Structure formats: structure tokens, C-alpha cells
Amino acid sequence: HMLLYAVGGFDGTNRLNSAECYYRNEWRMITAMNTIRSGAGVCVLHNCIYAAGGYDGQDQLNSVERYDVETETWTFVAPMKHRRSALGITVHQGRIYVLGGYDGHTFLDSVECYDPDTDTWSEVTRMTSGRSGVGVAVT
Amino acid sequence: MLLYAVGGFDGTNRLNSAECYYRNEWRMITAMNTIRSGAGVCVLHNCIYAAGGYDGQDQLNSVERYDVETETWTFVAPMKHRRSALGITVHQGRIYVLGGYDGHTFLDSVECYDPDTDTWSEVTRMTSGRSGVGVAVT
Numbered sequence A: 001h002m003l004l005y006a007v008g009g010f011d012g013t014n015r016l017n018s019a020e021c022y023y024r025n026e027w028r029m030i031t032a033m034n035t036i037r038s039g040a041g042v043c044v045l046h047n048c049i050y051a052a053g054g055y056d057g058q059d060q061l062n063s064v065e066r067y068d069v070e071t072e073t074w075t076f077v078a079p080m081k082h083r084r085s086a087l088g089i090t091v092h093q094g095r096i097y098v099l100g101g102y103d104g105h106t107f108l109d110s111v112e113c114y115d116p117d118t119d120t121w122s123e124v125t126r127m128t129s130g131r132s133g134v135g136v137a138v139t
Numbered sequence B: 001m002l003l004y005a006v007g008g009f010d011g012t013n014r015l016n017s018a019e020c021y022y023r024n025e026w027r028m029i030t031a032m033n034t035i036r037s038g039a040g041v042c043v044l045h046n047c048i049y050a051a052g053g054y055d056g057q058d059q060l061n062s063v064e065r066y067d068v069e070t071e072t073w074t075f076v077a078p079m080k081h082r083r084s085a086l087g088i089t090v091h092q093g094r095i096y097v098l099g100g101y102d103g104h105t106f107l108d109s110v111e112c113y114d115p116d117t118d119t120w121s122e123v124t125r126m127t128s129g130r131s132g133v134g135v136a137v138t
Helices: none
Strands: A004-010 A015-022 A027-029 A041-045 A048-052 A064-068 A073-077 A088-092 A095-099 A110-115 A120-126 A135-138 B003-009 B014-021 B026-029 B040-044 B047-051 B063-067 B072-075 B087-090 B095-098 B109-114 B119-125 B134-137
Touching (some): A041 B134, A048 A095, A088 A135
Antiparallel strands (some): A004 A015, A004 B134, A015 A027, A110 A120, B040 B047, B047 B063, B087 B095, B109 B119
């Protein structure tokens, strides 16, 4: 926890796969992701930035990639069971939790859980109703 | 130790409701004061903050805070800019919101919330106005 990262997004004309980091003031670019992602789930787990799902301008994404700060390289990990944009994301006890989102036809209520050690995504529970754009909090 | 799902959009209505997962059971808690979809939601100290979002007609700049002890939502200082599809993170006891959509412009503004002084301040600007960004601190 020292540097702020801005990952992907949408500028009103193009959706972004680029990422910048704030330091000298100034936002400087880092290595761009392998996939154009807007509205992705972005979190930090074991000093790696994870980027899950999102919208590339045509399709809802299920791919997940992680950025290694030491190698400055984005790498794909196991993809989610569901494509989703406008998902909520949180990290709890060394695992990534994604909640809801939109798969292209359905507002999901699925909640998937990522185990980094085994590189698996597994559904852990389901919200009371399918919905997207949710905020997630653990306290 | 509890998971909270705040607001959202079920495909027909935007939601101001919130629920907590315990006994493998999702249980509803006190609903928010403002209908919020795609708001910035984080945990500062031990309170849930919900900043901005879309209520169905307008983009929101209001910020309310849920106290787990008192089970109530309280409005705090509003952001200088209305924002939907904003990024949000907590870092050294402060909230950072990044970009988003204000109803006409994709924002490059970054605001910082100090809970002690209840103030938002514009810290810097991103290289370009943008929305739907993921924020990470590491």
C-alpha cells in the first residue's frame, strides 16, 4: 500500500486497457492490460492488482488478469464462471469476492469466490435478487 | 467479518436497499436515504460509505455513512462533483474517488475525503476524463 493506480475505464469515445499510477505529482503510465476493460472489478491481493470482468465496448468479459508490480507484467488467471460488467468486488481473508453484475442478458445474483492458491473460481452464495452496480463492503 | 451489498440495479428499479450476509442467510438491513446504483462504496474505520451513484434520473454527489452500531445511515459532506461509475478506495484513513460521469462530462477529477474534518478536497487530476475505472492501492 503506497501508490494509487487508475485501471482501465471509458473516456466517452474509447474504452481503456491502459493503467496509470500516481506518484513528483504527475500520473505516469504503467504496462497496459491485455484486455480493454471498463467497469471492471479491481482489487489488491498479495501485492497484486486484479482486474476482473468489465466491458470492452462489445462484449461483457469473464477474463481475469493480475498485475505483478515487481515484474510489471499483466497475466491472465482463471476466468470467472460468469461474464459480468458493473460488478462489485472485495477482498476478504485472502480471497476475491465478486457480487452480481450484468452478463449481457441477465442481472446476476451469483457471488463467485477466487482462491489464489488453487486458481479456482467457485460460487459461494447468491444474493436475494439479481442486480448490478452494487457496492460491496466488509466490516 | 460481514459482507454487505449496498444499492444496485435489479434490471427495472434502482435500489436504495442494503443487505448483509451472515447461518448461510442474506438478511436485509436499514435502507439507504438515497437511491444509489453504481456508487462508490468502501469501509472507512468501521463505517460503510456510499458516495455518488445514479438514482435513475440524476447523478449523485451526496455521501451517506452507515454505522453498524447505530444501524442508521447519515449524510456527510457531499463531493464537489456528481459522479456515477466512479472508482473508490481507502488509503491512510481517507477516501479517494476517481473520475466517473456527471451527466454530461467524463470526469478527470480526483477527490479526497477526510473524515476528521468532514471535507472533500480536489487532490489532483487524471491524465484524461474517464469513467468506469478500477482503483487500487499497493
